[PDB]
């Protein structure tokens, strides 16, 4: 007759081994989530960045009226243009 | 691990029969639910990032 102490110790060892295996699976999933969180952050940053446009850079040459500016775009064509209200 | 060995040796019936089994069952069920949820979220977010 196997001693109850031996049975309890064997059951505890088996449960600990199963818990260690499950912990290894959890650690693998956690590493996957950690990598994929930064990967998804970069992916969403790129996707948001894709929808955005550039601003022509040009030099203001004179301020005609309170909301009229003459701007000489770097290529050379001169425009009369407005101005954003909070500036 | 010494504390666990002592608990399992000195207390063979008062702990293994009731305390250990229920705690282990609760832990494994919680971990399985967490694994399933994490796998579902990972698959959904993998499809989203695809």
TrEMBL record, chain A:
Which domain of life does the protein's organism represent?
Eukaryota
Q: What is its main location?
A: cytoplasm
Supply the name of the protein.
Answer: 26S proteasome regulatory subunit 10B
Give the transmembrane region(s).
Answer: none
Q: Which organism is it from?
A: Homo sapiens (Human)
Protein family per UniProt: Belongs to the AAA ATPase family.
What is the annotated localization of this protein? Answer: Cytoplasm; Nucleus
**Which residues fall in a coiled-coil region?**
12-53
GO CC entries = cytoplasm; nucleus; proteasome complex
A GO molecular function term, named singly, is: ATP hydrolysis activity
Which key words tag this protein in UniProt? Acetylation, ATP-binding, Coiled coil, Cytoplasm, Metal-binding, Nucleotide-binding, Nucleus, Proteasome
């Amino acid at each position: 007759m196997a001693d109850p102490r031996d049975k309890a110790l064997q059951d505890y060892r088996k449960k600990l081994l199963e818990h260690k295996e499950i912990d290894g699976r959890l650690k693998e999933l956690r590493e996957q989530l950690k990598e994929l969180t930064k990967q998804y952050e970069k992916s969403e940053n790129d996707l948001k960045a894709l929808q955005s446009v550039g601003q022509i850079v040009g030099e203001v040459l004179k301020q005609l009226t309170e909301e009229k500016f003459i701007v000489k775009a770097t290529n050379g064509p001169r425009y009369v243009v407005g101005c954003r209200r909070q500036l | 691990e010494q504390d666990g060995i002592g608990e399992e040796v000195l207390k063979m019936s008062t702990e293994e029969i009731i305390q250990r089994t229920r705690l282990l069952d609760s832990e494994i069920k919680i971990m399985k639910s967490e694994v399933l949820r994490v796998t579902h979220e990972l698959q959904a977010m993998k499809d989203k990032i695809k």
